[PDB]
Design an enzyme around this catalytic site. Structure first.
Site, PDB file in Angstrom:
ATOM      1  N   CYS C  45       1.646  -3.461   0.151  1.00  0.00           N
ATOM      2  CA  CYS C  45       0.972  -2.959  -1.035  1.00  0.00           C
ATOM      3  C   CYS C  45       0.277  -4.130  -1.729  1.00  0.00           C
ATOM      4  O   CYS C  45       0.698  -5.272  -1.585  1.00  0.00           O
ATOM      5  CB  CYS C  45       1.984  -2.282  -1.957  1.00  0.00           C
ATOM      6  SG  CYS C  45       1.250  -1.459  -3.395  1.00  0.00           S
ATOM      7  N   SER C  46      -0.827  -3.844  -2.428  1.00  0.00           N
ATOM      8  CA  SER C  46      -1.510  -4.847  -3.225  1.00  0.00           C
ATOM      9  C   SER C  46      -2.354  -4.114  -4.253  1.00  0.00           C
ATOM     10  O   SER C  46      -3.534  -3.868  -4.020  1.00  0.00           O
ATOM     11  CB  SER C  46      -2.380  -5.753  -2.369  1.00  0.00           C
ATOM     12  OG  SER C  46      -2.984  -6.769  -3.166  1.00  0.00           O
ATOM     13  N   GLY C  47      -1.717  -3.685  -5.340  1.00  0.00           N
ATOM     14  CA  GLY C  47      -2.346  -2.722  -6.238  1.00  0.00           C
ATOM     15  C   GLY C  47      -2.991  -1.594  -5.430  1.00  0.00           C
ATOM     16  O   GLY C  47      -4.186  -1.336  -5.558  1.00  0.00           O
ATOM     17  N   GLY C  48      -2.184  -0.948  -4.584  1.00  0.00           N
ATOM     18  CA  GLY C  48      -2.704  -0.100  -3.527  1.00  0.00           C
ATOM     19  C   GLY C  48      -3.268  -0.936  -2.378  1.00  0.00           C
ATOM     20  O   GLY C  48      -2.533  -1.700  -1.751  1.00  0.00           O
ATOM     21  N   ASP C  53      -5.016  -4.863   5.901  1.00  0.00           N
ATOM     22  CA  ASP C  53      -5.684  -5.414   7.066  1.00  0.00           C
ATOM     23  C   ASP C  53      -4.686  -5.463   8.214  1.00  0.00           C
ATOM     24  O   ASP C  53      -3.538  -5.071   8.029  1.00  0.00           O
ATOM     25  CB  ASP C  53      -6.273  -6.793   6.766  1.00  0.00           C
ATOM     26  CG  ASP C  53      -5.217  -7.735   6.218  1.00  0.00           C
ATOM     27  OD1 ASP C  53      -4.200  -7.984   6.928  1.00  0.00           O
ATOM     28  OD2 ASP C  53      -5.403  -8.191   5.086  1.00  0.00           O
ATOM     29  N   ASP C  67      -3.881   2.881  -5.318  1.00  0.00           N
ATOM     30  CA  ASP C  67      -3.351   3.325  -6.603  1.00  0.00           C
ATOM     31  C   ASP C  67      -4.031   4.620  -7.044  1.00  0.00           C
ATOM     32  O   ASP C  67      -3.489   5.343  -7.872  1.00  0.00           O
ATOM     33  CB  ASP C  67      -3.455   2.254  -7.705  1.00  0.00           C
ATOM     34  CG  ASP C  67      -2.335   1.224  -7.623  1.00  0.00           C
ATOM     35  OD1 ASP C  67      -1.336   1.512  -6.959  1.00  0.00           O
ATOM     36  OD2 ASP C  67      -2.472   0.140  -8.198  1.00  0.00           O
ATOM     37  N   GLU C 133       6.429  25.036  -9.705  1.00  0.00           N
ATOM     38  CA  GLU C 133       5.863  23.821  -9.153  1.00  0.00           C
ATOM     39  C   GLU C 133       6.862  23.196  -8.178  1.00  0.00           C
ATOM     40  O   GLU C 133       6.460  22.704  -7.126  1.00  0.00           O
ATOM     41  CB  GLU C 133       5.465  22.874 -10.295  1.00  0.00           C
ATOM     42  CG  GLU C 133       4.294  23.383 -11.130  1.00  0.00           C
ATOM     43  CD  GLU C 133       4.151  22.812 -12.540  1.00  0.00           C
ATOM     44  OE1 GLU C 133       5.137  22.281 -13.090  1.00  0.00           O
ATOM     45  OE2 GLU C 133       3.048  22.923 -13.097  1.00  0.00           O
TER      46      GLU C 133
HETATM   47  O1  LIG Z   1       3.905  -2.304 -11.190  1.00  0.00           O
HETATM   48  C1  LIG Z   1       4.196  -1.368 -10.125  1.00  0.00           C
HETATM   49  C2  LIG Z   1       2.856  -0.901  -9.525  1.00  0.00           C
HETATM   50  O2  LIG Z   1       2.318  -2.010  -8.832  1.00  0.00           O
HETATM   51  C3  LIG Z   1       1.052  -1.763  -8.164  1.00  0.00           C
HETATM   52  O3  LIG Z   1       0.040  -1.220  -9.050  1.00  0.00           O
HETATM   53  C4  LIG Z   1      -0.352  -2.165  -9.929  1.00  0.00           C
HETATM   54  C5  LIG Z   1      -1.259  -1.337 -10.834  1.00  0.00           C
HETATM   55  O4  LIG Z   1      -0.462  -0.307 -11.449  1.00  0.00           O
HETATM   56  C6  LIG Z   1      -1.064   0.466 -12.501  1.00  0.00           C
HETATM   57  O5  LIG Z   1      -2.004   1.335 -11.874  1.00  0.00           O
HETATM   58  C7  LIG Z   1      -1.794  -0.429 -13.503  1.00  0.00           C
HETATM   59  O6  LIG Z   1      -2.483   0.377 -14.441  1.00  0.00           O
HETATM   60  C8  LIG Z   1      -2.813  -1.300 -12.785  1.00  0.00           C
HETATM   61  O7  LIG Z   1      -3.566  -2.045 -13.732  1.00  0.00           O
HETATM   62  C9  LIG Z   1      -2.066  -2.204 -11.808  1.00  0.00           C
HETATM   63  O8  LIG Z   1      -3.033  -2.899 -11.012  1.00  0.00           O
HETATM   64  C10 LIG Z   1       1.323  -0.832  -6.992  1.00  0.00           C
HETATM   65  O9  LIG Z   1       0.170  -0.658  -6.169  1.00  0.00           O
HETATM   66  C11 LIG Z   1       1.737   0.447  -7.651  1.00  0.00           C
HETATM   67  O10 LIG Z   1       2.070   1.344  -6.608  1.00  0.00           O
HETATM   68  C12 LIG Z   1       3.001   0.220  -8.498  1.00  0.00           C
HETATM   69  O11 LIG Z   1       4.053  -0.120  -7.612  1.00  0.00           O
END
Ligand SMILES: OC[C@H]1O[C@H](OC[C@H]2O[C@H](O)[C@H](O)[C@@H](O)[C@@H]2O)[C@H](O)[C@@H](O)[C@H]1O
Ligand SMILES: OC[C@H]1O[C@H](OC[C@H]2O[C@H](O)[C@H](O)[C@@H](O)[C@@H]2O)[C@H](O)[C@@H](O)[C@H]1O
Ligand SMILES: OC[C@H]1O[C@H](OC[C@H]2O[C@H](O)[C@H](O)[C@@H](O)[C@@H]2O)[C@H](O)[C@@H](O)[C@H]1O
Lengths: 721, 721, 246, 228
Positions: C45-48, C53, C67, C133
């Site tokens: 993961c990396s902010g999604g 890669d 994300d 739901e």
């Molecule tokens: O902190 C846990 C979170 O980490 C990663 O996402 C980081 C993002 O999360 C929120 O969307 C926030 O608003 C963004 O600004 C930040 O980049 C990971 O990809 C997430 O699945 C979650 O684990």
């Protein structure tokens, strides 16, 4: 200097910034130039006469003159020109004519075909009258071209006289044609569909023939009588555009033909499909008026030329510069299920929010409890209305509201007293079952008894009742042509239907000129310049979705002024699209047109009522700017765009509406630049009090900011200080 | 009103119709607007500050300010901005800098980097001086932006000072950068190839990075130091264009980067490839001058802005408005095989046909009998020339002809006395064999002994001989970089080579300012604005084919004035293309540039001689119109076009040249419209005596008529009455 | 986050090395842990999708693709995320409405069907859902248990690509006797003829029984005539066609 | 049949339905074909050797051989090829190298760089080992190309050895390069943004240079290490 001039063998038709220069060459008329003004024309752009193979000749010994290769202003078949013809007349054993120029005259002032909508306010016009004759056939063809001193538009139409001893038959008679020199061109048209009216189409001109046409007996939802031939690479701001349009609401065709040499013909007129016209000796035929309009300022330039000409010379003077009332219509609000109590409740609420006009829609007449009966029975249902129509109207007047009423005169239901009394008044073919459409039939308005009956019934309705507004619907297309006593009379009945319509509506609009008439045809099914001669606004579309409306309003105001363009705030979920949109967005989209409301105000929350009252307050202020001002498209809503933005200038007022369709993320904000301001002007933005020079607004533009979410909108309002 | 203004935290750089507005935001410089003039800028188009994911921040607590998302005028790496950087400096253990604005000054008048070509005629300019400092690194970066009062151009460059106690190393230092707001853009560049120079390329800006660059130690045949960022849909006549250009003849890069948010960065400067720059304490580095030029009149608008600025502020004043001599060059005519008799015979014939200047090309020096030896031996071959050069020159002067001579100073052959005396003067790497190109090597002009020797040899040649014209060739690219005493010095030698070139050529052009210098590099191998500061014309291409020349001249005069653009009528079959073209067409194509001749006049028929004399007569008349007048492209020669047409206006004279490449049949004649005339003007066409209003010529245009056949041409000449 | 402020070397050259050395250190770390704990499923993961890669996928057999958990915003994302990488890798979770990134209401059916074109999970507060739901989610979980081998192990065929100009997305999966097709429409349309959607890579002579109507179609019909795709009025509607080869 | 073959001066790297055919031409490595399988390759698509202006030469007298115009599998700067280089090494006063082919070997099975993720399940692979040397700089460059018997894929990487007495510095070292013949091409990439990952981009190949890159120390949301 403008008007008509005859100098040796050249005819100059000179409108403001637009000239048509025609040469008489031994009886043949040549199109020398159509475009920006040229005086002392010499012929730099003359066709070079050479032998083109298979392009034939009027004389044996000169292979270089051919009507296949000369640029012309009307087209015949059988004399060597093989391009699509625009005049074609049967007489004796042939449909070959050879009309030759014999004489030119110049008229001043009012002039137009009888029984067909034509320009008004013509004091400052002049008309070139080119009299042609086929001496063997003993026919006359007379071409008219009219200048306008205040617009880059020329109008045309023709008259065909039968001066022979036998019946003759017109097969083709277009209203305007032009042969343009080989070059790269694009065409813009307005097409689309019911609930998708006037979709702007742009494409490359290719060898062969492109056309749009209606064979529906109305111009139709899916094509508008317009065709813009554009310079390759035209933009909103730049390039040459020629718009050819038709003042006609029946069957029409517009075509572009690129022939074997890369030459390009364009023409507009009555569709050859479903048309023939018998002329007895001494009888004559006049075609509808066509318009040719020009700009060298791109698509915004042609929008402006076209809107101006419509406002000044087509739309009724009584209304063309008159602010239109903000209305409520009960249609989407109740459908057929209403009664006096509901109506006056709706009226009370409309009054509270500052609505000006109340329109009683379908369902007030005969036993019209659904859409399966009663058309043709224009008798008030006093039970449903809880008393006389007079009684309902006074009730509405006393509440401070103007009163409007829906009609559908051109139609008859099988289940109606009218149909029971006169089954033969329907358009039909002996020995064939009806084709049905919305379970109704079309009245044969080619039958003079039908027209006289509708004049009588409606005159009676309008004189005996204090009606301020009419909505005139027409809800199907014409099938089963067979009411003639001969085949030729049936082939005439679709154009005669139109003549009957125009006789009917010109009579009523004239004898009741205080009433505002809104044309309708399941929304935008017949939104053309023929109807707009009599009906100064039009229900642009049954699609009242705020987002679906974006491309519709784009098209609907492309050539026609915004003032004409009915737009109503409606309920959610929207009834056509099944969509939730913000009430703010429905407001702002409808306020880019001629505002009304069409939802059950009695069923709204206190909050929604308050919002509507605020919108009504806002539009009262914005109405002159939108309806009377100059429109500038800033971002076009199309298939690929996620956005729409339209600006209006009116003296010291400048407004811009912006809509975004889909929510976006990690996307830089749009920069939106305004048009047509004073560089040095100082513009105070209402929301933040900040003052921007026109230069900043035009050359730097606005960072457009929105929250997350779909179908959000905003408006920027500017006062020039 | 124009020049520089400092108002609170805004800096306005104001040229004619072009402003750069910069905000100081707590030490960070923000690009607020680059475009048409705005006074009292408020910030309608400010970036909206939000949290963009993975866009980082200078402080912990403010997530909304990021150098990843701010629009800027210079780029750093490592502070959160991930776009391509334009300044990057190694110091201590890092190449992170953080230059912060500390102070602004305004200069008036002449101003530019030392040792690099820069604008002249600067009396009416003002320069914004933005002084930045990295206090930790103890470096200063100073940005300069110069206004022009008579042109929509701003010039830029920077100075980096090392104020620390240690050596530091510059890795990147571009001359200009701009962050433009997300919008649809196109880019135009001039690329192509040897014998295909300056091919106009147009494409869409796409996410990612596009670049053109040279790593050849000259700007090169295949890319020009220019990049035009255009409004989507730009035409010749309309739309916004921003042209960024570099006054530099060495390794350069231009790039366009569209980042993750749809933002767009453009920059131009010294290529990072093959470049590092050592600064000892107190030492400084100045970058070459970049230019940003603007039009809102499309591609013709930017051609005109660029040509004007070059004519008035780059090209030597002595020549920029001086008609250039019609020359003969013997190169294609004889190659290396000539002697005194042949030369004077050629001269006699040149004189008969009215040629003004005689250029002795390659082969007069050392034992230069072919292209395999002698470069570096600038000694007259008195045997070949049949006596002293002085003797040949007088012979040529006495025949009525000015005298010109070919040099190739920057080169050395292995087989030469020079190479025998100084093998170490070649660009080379210890212990690697030479890479050869046209069997020659490049002199290391980074070696001050090389520069001093070339100054001396050439000064001697120019003072001791009555030479009116120099042609300065340079016939290969730079390989085998390894002459430094350290790696860093080798990484410096390509830019030092350029500094040595500029020192050499500025010295000679200055000390011999009466001589017309023509730059050359196998034709158009180094045709840039660095060279054009010193050499007021350039051999545009070795391709002397009349048809192949069409796209070449299109590109070669796109940003540079026609006066600069050498073009010679040559023999058939053409030596590059293997093609027969009409002598008329070779004449007319070459007359769209700076006319000369390059074929063996002694071997022509009596008829061909007569034709050439007639062409020379014609061009003497057309020369001011072509060289001094305003150029208008009417039909562009590209990959898909079968045509080329170019117009020139100069006071009462208007000429149009038309060429068709392939013969066509059963195709309507082109209609060719002229530009920029008086509508009411009366224009008399020389060939037919007919008088046309400007309106007719512009709005109707000329039917262009030609016989059957390939590569035909014609010229229309007009006098305004 | 991304790497700023490079300056930890003892020399300039060592700093210029540290970004690649960082990577070598990462790979040493993750290869060690993935190897010494090979029973554990590691999701990168990396902010999604910030580092999705083939370097990471050597060690982490799935990845949080984005994300953005919006069902509609996900369409182009899944298009790209499975372009070169197998569907099995592509994390996709049914999330709450209004969606937290886009501010959008989408049908729970559509969020289900879009997430089921990837590696299904859930990411919303199940304790705050209605009884209805919950039931829907249990049905989706039941459905995906059946569809999982077809989606994760089967062969993917893009039928309509979600791009800037398309109002549609459709993806097919074949796995032995199972063929599924998911169709999504973004904006509601009116007076527009229904799309014809043709399937790929079937046996012409094969007999394919469509689950919803029991009808049996030859592969030829499904490939060469295709399906008239029918939807009500409304935005972001979806449907799934499930086929068993007989 | 698949794996690696050495036949005179041709090297065949043969995966399932994909071949890389390389010619040793006097120490220079030429890309002869990359595409569908060809056995008994003759050279129908060989570069035609001519004098291209400003394209220079390793010897004085032959103007028709130029590394500016030969199709190759790795790129150097300073020997006459002006295309973007993929190996660039500083040593002494220069960053000119001239790696020449000296010897080829063939490996079977598992093989890959140390400390970097590489293919697994390699029992049925073979690796072409092309050993190059710059004798003046005393550097070795070794190129590896690996076949797969069950996939139309070839893997590559290189090893640079410093066999000299001084420190040297690598400035560029790409993992794969190919010179493809002039023709019309398009490129597909995966770009996009955070919350818009892997947006499929398609465009025309134009004169000049197009690139995607990350300088973020991770591959990044906005570009994927892929180019079609
Ligand atoms: O902190 C846990 C979170 O980490 C990663 O996402 C980081 C993002 O999360 C929120 O969307 C926030 O608003 C963004 O600004 C930040 O980049 C990971 O990809 C997430 O699945 C979650 O684990
Ligand atoms: O009947 C009154 C109604 O007439 C026109 O619309 C007709 C359409 O109305 C409904 O949308 C129906 O579902 C459609 O099938 C039918 O075409 C008119 O345009 C409407 O404003 C309204 O007056
Ligand atoms: O040598 C004199 C010559 O120099 C330049 O041209 C060099 C080219 O000349 C020939 O075309 C040759 O075939 C080419 O390979 C070579 O590059 C200069 O540009 C020429 O005008 C001429 O002076």
């Amino acid at each position: 200097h403008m008007g008509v001039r005859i100098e040796n063998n050249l005819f100059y038709v000179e409108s403001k910034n637009l000239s048509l220069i025609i040469e008489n060459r031994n009886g043949y008329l040549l199109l020398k130039h159509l475009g920006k003004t040229i005086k002392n024309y010499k012929g730099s752009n003359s066709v070079y006469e050479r032998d083109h193979a298979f392009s034939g000749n009027p004389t044996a010994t000169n292979r270089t003159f051919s009507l296949d290769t000369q640029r012309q202003i009307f087209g015949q078949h059988g004399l060597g020109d093989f391009r699509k013809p625009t005049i074609q007349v049967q007489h004796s054993v042939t449909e070959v004519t050879d009309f030759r120029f014999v004489e030119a005259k110049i008229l001043k002032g009012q002039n137009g075909p009888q029984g067909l909508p034509s320009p008004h306010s013509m004091d400052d016009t002049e008309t070139l009258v080119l009299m042609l004759e086929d001496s063997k056939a003993q026919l006359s063809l007379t071409l008219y071209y009219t200048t306008f001193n205040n617009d880059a538009t020329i109008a045309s139409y023709s008259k065909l006289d039968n001066n022979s001893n036998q019946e003759v038959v017109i097969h083709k008679d277009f209203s305007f044609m032009a042969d343009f020199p080989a070059a790269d061109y694009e065409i813009v048209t307005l097409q689309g569909a019911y609930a998708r009216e006037k979709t702007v189409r742009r494409q490359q001109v290719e060898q062969g023939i492109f056309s749009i046409s209606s064979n529906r007996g109305a111009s139709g939802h899916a094509q508008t009588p317009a065709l813009l031939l554009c310079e390759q690479g035209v933009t909103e701001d730049a390039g040459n555009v020629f718009a050819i349009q038709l003042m006609y609401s029946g069957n029409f065709e517009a075509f572009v033909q690129k022939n074997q040499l890369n030459e390009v013909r364009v023409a507009i007129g009555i569709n050859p499909e479903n048309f023939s016209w018998k002329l007895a000796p001494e009888e004559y035929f006049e075609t509808p008026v066509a318009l040719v309009t020009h700009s060298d300022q791109g698509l915004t330039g042609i929008s402006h030329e076209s809107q101006n000409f419509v406002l000044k010379h087509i739309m009724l003077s009584e209304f063309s510069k008159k602010e239109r009332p903000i209305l409520i219509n009960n249609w989407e609000a109740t459908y057929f299920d209403f009664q006096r109590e509901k109506l006056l409740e709706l009226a009370d609420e409309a009054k509270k929010v500052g609505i000006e006009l109340f329109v009683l829609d379908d369902g007030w007449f005969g036993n019209r409890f659904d859409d399966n009966r009663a058309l043709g029975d224009w008798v008030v249902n006093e039970e449903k209305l809880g008393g006389s129509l007079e009684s309902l109207i006074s009730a509405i007047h006393e509440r401070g509201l103007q009163f409007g009423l829906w009609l559908e005169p051109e139609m008859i239901s099988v289940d109606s007293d009218l149909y029971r009394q006169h089954p033969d008044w329907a358009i039909q073919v002996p020995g064939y079952e009806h084709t049905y459409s919305r379970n109704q039939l079309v009245l044969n308005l080619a039958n003079p008894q039908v027209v006289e009956y509708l004049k009588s019934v409606l005159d009676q309705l309008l004189f005996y009742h204090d009606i301020d507004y009419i909505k005139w619907n027409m809800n199907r297309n014409i099938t089963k042509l067979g009411n003639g006593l001969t085949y030729l009379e049936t082939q005439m009945q679709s154009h005669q239907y139109m003549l009957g319509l125009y006789e009917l509506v010109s009579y009523l609009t004239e004898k009741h000129s205080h009433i505002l008439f809104e044309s309708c045809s399941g929304g935008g099914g017949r939104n053309d310049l023929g109807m707009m001669r009599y009906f100064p606004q039009v229900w642009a579309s049954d699609n009242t979705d705020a987002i679906a409306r974006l491309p519709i309003q784009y098209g609907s105001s492309y050539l026609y002024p915004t003032i004409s363009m009915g737009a109503h705030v409606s309920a959610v979920p929207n009834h056509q699209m099944g969509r939730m949109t913000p009430l703010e967005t429905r407001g702002l989209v409808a306020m880019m047109g001629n505002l009304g409301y069409e939802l059950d105000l009695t069923n709204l929350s206190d909050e929604e009522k308050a919002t509507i009252a605020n919108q009504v307050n806002l539009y009262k202020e914005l109405r002159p700017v939108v309806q009377l001002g100059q429109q500038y498209r800033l971002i076009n809503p199309d298939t690929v765009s996620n956005e729409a933005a339209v600006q209006f200038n009116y003296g010291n007022q400048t407004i811009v509406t912006y809509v975004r369709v889909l929510s976006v993320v990690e996307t830089m904000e749009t920069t939106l630049k305004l048009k047509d301001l004073d560089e040095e002007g100082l513009y105070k933005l209402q929301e933040n009090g900040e003052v921007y020079s026109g230069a900043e607004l035009m050359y730097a533009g606005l960072t457009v900011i929105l929250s997350q979410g779909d179908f959000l909108s905003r408006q920027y309002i500017f006062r020039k200080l």
